[PDB]
Symmetry: D2
Subunit: 247 residues, 4 copies
Amino acid sequence: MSQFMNLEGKVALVTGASRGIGKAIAELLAERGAKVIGTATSESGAQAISDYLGDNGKGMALNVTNPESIEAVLKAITDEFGGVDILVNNAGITRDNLLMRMKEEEWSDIMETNLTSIFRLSKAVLRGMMKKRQGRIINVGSVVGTMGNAGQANYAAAKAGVIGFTKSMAREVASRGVTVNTVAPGFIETDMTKLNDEQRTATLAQVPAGRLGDPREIASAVAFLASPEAAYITGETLHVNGGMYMI
Amino acid sequence: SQFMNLEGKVALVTGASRGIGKAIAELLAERGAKVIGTATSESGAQAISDYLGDNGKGMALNVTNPESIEAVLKAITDEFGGVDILVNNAGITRDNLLMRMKEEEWSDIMETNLTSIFRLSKAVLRGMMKKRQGRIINVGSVVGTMGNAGQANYAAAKAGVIGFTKSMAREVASRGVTVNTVAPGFIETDMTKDEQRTATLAQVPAGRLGDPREIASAVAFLASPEAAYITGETLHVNGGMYMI
Amino acid sequence: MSQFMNLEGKVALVTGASRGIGKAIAELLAERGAKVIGTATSESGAQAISDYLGDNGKGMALNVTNPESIEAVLKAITDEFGGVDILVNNAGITRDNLLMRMKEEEWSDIMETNLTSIFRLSKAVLRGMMKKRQGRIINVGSVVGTMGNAGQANYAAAKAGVIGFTKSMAREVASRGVTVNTVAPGFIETDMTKLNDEQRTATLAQVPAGRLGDPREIASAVAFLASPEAAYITGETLHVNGGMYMI
Amino acid sequence: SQFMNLEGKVALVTGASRGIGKAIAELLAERGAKVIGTATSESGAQAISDYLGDNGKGMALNVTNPESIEAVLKAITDEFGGVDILVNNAGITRDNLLMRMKEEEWSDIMETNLTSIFRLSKAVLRGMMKKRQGRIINVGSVVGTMGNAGQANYAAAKAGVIGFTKSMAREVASRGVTVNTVAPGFIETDMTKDEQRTATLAQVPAGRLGDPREIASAVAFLASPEAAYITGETLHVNGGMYMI
Ligand SMILES: NC(=O)c1ccc[n+]([C@@H]2O[C@H](COP(=O)([O-])OP(=O)(O)OC[C@H]3O[C@@H](n4cnc5c(N)ncnc54)[C@H](OP(=O)(O)O)[C@@H]3O)[C@@H](O)[C@H]2O)c1
Ligand SMILES: NC(=O)c1ccc[n+]([C@@H]2O[C@H](COP(=O)([O-])OP(=O)(O)OC[C@H]3O[C@@H](n4cnc5c(N)ncnc54)[C@H](OP(=O)(O)O)[C@@H]3O)[C@@H](O)[C@H]2O)c1
Ligand SMILES: NC(=O)c1ccc[n+]([C@@H]2O[C@H](COP(=O)([O-])OP(=O)(O)OC[C@H]3O[C@@H](n4cnc5c(N)ncnc54)[C@H](OP(=O)(O)O)[C@@H]3O)[C@@H](O)[C@H]2O)c1
Ligand SMILES: NC(=O)c1ccc[n+]([C@@H]2O[C@H](COP(=O)([O-])OP(=O)(O)OC[C@H]3O[C@@H](n4cnc5c(N)ncnc54)[C@H](OP(=O)(O)O)[C@@H]3O)[C@@H](O)[C@H]2O)c1
């Protein structure tokens, strides 16, 4: 209702919003007033997004590794809603393996999807933001980017790369009222995590909080950084991990 | 709404007569907390009571005085019950290059900016642990992470705050208490009140000083139910002056 | 002469050793007893390396973006010298631009050369190291990876990615006596830096030491991490930047 | 050889009677430094004189006593000239969960592990600055960066050490003095002397405790001419226990 953390008038683009964290981000940004565009890799996924967003946004099909798709989706957004004010780079995948078993494809698929996508999507929205002297870019990273993790050298390289990209863009655009930050979740209750008894208990053994995080808790950190009130935060990595790692 | 709603929470914000501390106390009150803010003099305490009105009150407190801390906490507990949110904002500077830095300038900083947080955190923790819910939020400084010439004492204390924070976060996370630090960059306050500002501003990509309200916002965020999965963190609010 | 920081018996592979930092690394490792293989992108570069290394190693032509070249060079090394004990991933490039001017090629060339190369080269030497329960992997990163820098979002993403990769591999192989670390130089006196009066004075204005670093100073940090004495260091980033940035 | 050669340097290593401090003093001597190591008792000082032989000597020092520090520094300066390398190794632990942590357990840690570094660094800095060459190397702890339950006091001090380090590095870098921290993980010493070690080891990827010589090596490296471009750094030597 109030003027606090109020995103009325802002257009938000949330990639990979069909479920879990991306869905929670999209839902919360809309609740705080934003016109939200959520993306999925298929039209039926896009349609499921439209359905949960109702009058507060819509779903669009997007492949973040395809520049043609990116250009199509942003043109469509800008026509109806105007320039994107808030970009949330949530889309991402895992292709886990110990290094000696890791395929070239498994490395390159992670680079493309989890790191190079952020370069393309960010580049695609930045001009409009610089022109208006207002913007938010928020990348959904991971505790693994900062901590490292066995069996996820590719994922960790890509997520650490997102931080290096963020800090640099932060410096490039700070004087023009655009912030660029990363939110780094620890282990969050999701389809991915819903693992056998042993594995969950093992990861949980490394969380002081003694539980998995909720997608809503990641959404909240993203909504915070997206807000007018977070204008003096840039180049930051906001860790939301239950104490799994502390920097 | 239910979002970032602190209704039912009792907040203690030290050093709340002006600047960052006042912005924190005001915002926590606006989000529904019952707020007790402190100053070092009774007329300061009164001015806090005055701006809080029915949302809380002002008390006189010296954070380097065990008997003051104990008296203020008994007062708060008697009237409002135990503290749910602790904001350690009170802090000073005693700037000097090391070769000119007096024993008392080192020690005043250790006592006021670091030991105070040990004493106050200890004083509120048992209640938060029994309740299985709590927030301790320390107001650090970019200087704690970046260092700054002429502020080795201040940097030592503010870095120490983070080591303390990480340790306590580990100690109490399983009992639903979070411990975090908000690290302001250069914010327009009395502490920062032409060539010296231009020099500071030259190191801030944002090209401006931060507002006290912007620090308040970070503190309110971490104080919220929604920030329950954040602990042992240092949240930098510095316009890009430093990036970790 | 002594048993201190003694690399006698170790085989070192230093990529991009024809000049500057890579050359200084190669020269120092040889001085400390290592059999050193330095690489360049051409046979004449390789030959210049052979010439400075003399009886303590040789030059080889290597393209770190070509798996065929990598497999050829390691097979050649292993035949003559045995398994690589020390890998120094120094080869790298810059393709600077502000994001809005940055080409797809400029991004992908940096990813390939500065990040994906480390995946390939590391994967190529790790088995032998794990088998012997002894190894060093040392990546030459950059202060930019941790600090960010305007006009170098690609470079910074790749160099930050190297840290995420390092931490993960460090966890994967620590129990098998292999360390994996990064050395992150600040601004070092090199061909790259030998910039106009204004630009050098500008970068120097951000260095408390008030000078550029020497390539030998980077070589020393690498030699330190390569040593038996540094066995309890892994997953670390060793900053050698004159106080430009402090973590 | 000329490599990592400390001939002509005077090194002061506090807390050098055993463990890490002794490994540091021995290695600095082996690399050619004239070494003065300290213990808290004269028989400790004598044992240091005994293992150093002609490479240096042992002195009694309490790093929480200004008059002791001043006496030891005058002794060193009279005989050997001013200190070129300062190694702040002396440190203690006073473990307890916060609710059981006494005032004296907080303060002994602040005085012994943090304020001592202010006093000793201040005592040697003018000489290093005039000479335009110097090394101050603090022995921190992984706990300063990682935190640890039951060690909030120790973590606060060891984190504080790093804030101090970054500030002084900035202050004196232009005059050729470096200030750094080596942060040991769990090292086999008296301080760490079955289930408790297994629990510690379980968090170390290397699957072993560090050796005191491995910390000595890091200290010798940073003490060297070759490390002149390293300042304001924290060098972690922890077997992968933590990775920054
Ligand atoms: N799960 C965790 O515990 C955790 C922890 C830390 C960080 N994260 C990070 O948080 C983000 C979201 O995580 P999550 O676990 O909620 O993901 P998720 O439930 O697996 O969903 C992934 C989303 O990304 C989209 N996506 C995948 N590839 C794409 C592509 N090439 N182009 C466009 N979209 C694509 C998917 O689209 P479709 O719906 O069409 O498949 C989907 O909407 C990721 O960046 C992940 O790395 C997750
Ligand atoms: N401003 C900045 O640029 C900046 C940057 C980074 C961090 N910070 C941190 O932010 C916090 C507040 O900063 P500020 O700039 O708002 O400071 P400020 O304007 O000087 O206000 C300091 C507050 O602390 C109180 N205080 C001082 N000593 C005390 C003591 N011994 N016991 C109890 N209360 C005491 C003061 O009370 P009285 O009103 O009675 O004096 C006052 O309310 C500090 O911890 C500071 O280190 C500030
Ligand atoms: N210069 C600095 O101030 C500075 C600061 C921080 C970090 N660094 C990093 O330190 C490392 C070395 O820096 P530098 O400035 O000394 O480099 P440099 O003098 O420009 O030389 C680069 C070296 O890398 C090799 N190389 C380039 N592309 C290659 C490829 N595709 N395959 C194989 N080798 C290739 C070059 O081979 P050829 O000889 O055949 O061309 C050359 O030997 C780099 O990773 C750089 O990012 C430099
Ligand atoms: N061991 C570890 O796992 C570990 C890990 C991380 C960091 N560290 C750090 O490494 C340093 C040395 O550790 P350690 O394990 O070798 O400790 P230690 O075996 O307990 O030795 C401590 C040394 O400090 C001296 N000392 C104690 N209090 C002093 C005082 N007030 N004034 C002057 N000297 C004093 C002692 O002298 P006496 O011989 O006279 O008692 C002794 O020589 C400490 O700073 C510690 O915090 C150790």
